[PDB]
Amino acid sequence: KTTATLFLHGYGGSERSETFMVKQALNKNVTNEVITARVSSEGKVYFDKKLSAANPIVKVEFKDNKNGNFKENAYWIKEVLSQLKSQFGIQQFNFVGHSMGNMSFAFYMKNYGDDRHLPQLKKEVNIAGVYNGILNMNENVNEIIVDKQGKPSRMNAAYRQLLSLYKIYCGKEIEVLNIYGDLEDGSHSDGRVSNSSSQSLQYLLRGSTKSYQEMKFKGAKAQHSQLHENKDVANEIIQFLWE
Template sequence: MKKLWVLGASIIAIIVIVSLITVGMNKKQSNSKHQEREKDTQHSKYITSQTPTLFLHGYAGTLNSEKYMVNQAKKKGATKNVITAIVSNDGQVQLKGKLKKNATNPVVQIVLQNNKQGDYDINAKWFKNVLVKLQSEYKIKKFNFVGHSMGNLSFANYMYLYGDDQSLPQLNKQVNIAGTFNGVLNLNEKVNEISVDKNGKPSRMNQPYQKLLKLKGIYKGKHIEVLNIYSDLQDGTHSDGRVSNSSSKSLKYLLGHSPKSYKESKYEGQKAQHSQLHENSQVANELIEFLWGNKN
């Protein structure tokens, strides 16, 4: 009788142990599948593209001007591969880091050692040098652009000078933040001095705005998508404290109906001050969605 009791207890113990092992394995498999689903969902939020996105700071800007936006893109899983292109005072380009083969949505942070260069044509040539370097090293054919402040005018001059050069990588998408397309307050424009109409045409055209009117023809038929971000402190100046809304919004008239798409996005309040725009989480979220959001 005692032997039968011991045998029964042993059988029950074995059954319990097997049941616990089975439950544990099923739970582990379930958690694994859940993590895989979460991972797939995260990846599906963003496109998978090898087109690099180039960030360019403004006047007196540094790597810090781009760091927050880039880090937000990494944090959200839109990109993992980030390198830096340092442009020397004589326009030589040094790449720090390496773009991995078939990297998803890679980012290139451009740093101009002469960050107070006021000649937009020289800045445009330096930007071209970065593209040529990337083309030589990685055979890139297209690129996206994100610029802040004067970086946008430097890029506009790049497109004016080289936008029709088919031997260079071609622009895919561009994000302009606080663009100085038709002037800078207290430099060549007074507060509330210049206005724009519904088409973005300014009441007065400063240099080099007039020559940039040729951009309409350069952008035409290239299927370029444009996001133009600007801000208003809501203090009566109709500006971000440095650049008037009219100057930023005048990009619309420069491009006309030539881009595949054109969108203006306005931010308001102190967190939208000129230098704070590239530290603004909402701005970062919008540009990440614009550049890499999966519309499917």
């Protein structure tokens, strides 16, 4: 059975933000299929090439790529999934996203995560997830804290609408890998987002995933944008989704 692996860009980005990591996949023979799903502002979906095909990779680009509205960027996500099925029949998918493409996938799963007419999740890769806020926005550096279970010492607006998201992950045996960076510069962050922010995903999933792992890459090559431009991160993701 065929499983499309969708790559979503963070704020400001496009399909070119996803390239370095899928190019690491192709060099690993993973698949010969890559295609681009483009989504306008209205939310009509255009595929550049068609589909047939093992471990196919699909790159998702939103034309309106500066929309901070999680519910419409999670509505878009459901439009691509439901276009990949209506057209190519794909029944399951892996998801990997950068920063805010992941906050849009927590709102996808929240509003469309129990529907069955929709391609089902299998694995999940989360790069610099921005779950309990952003640095220098609605949080500050070393301010917010997480316990054992990734529960925030303080929870921000959006994080709270996502509390009942375990209810969706339960019993779907969804594996989840949580990748974030610690520059090591005394700020416990990826330059842009807090480790507690993305680490607070473990409390959103509440022990209801088939599998939950976190990887804290460290150093200069573990900076926000450096995360999807590292090869030691991209193989981490290859071996998880595909090996």
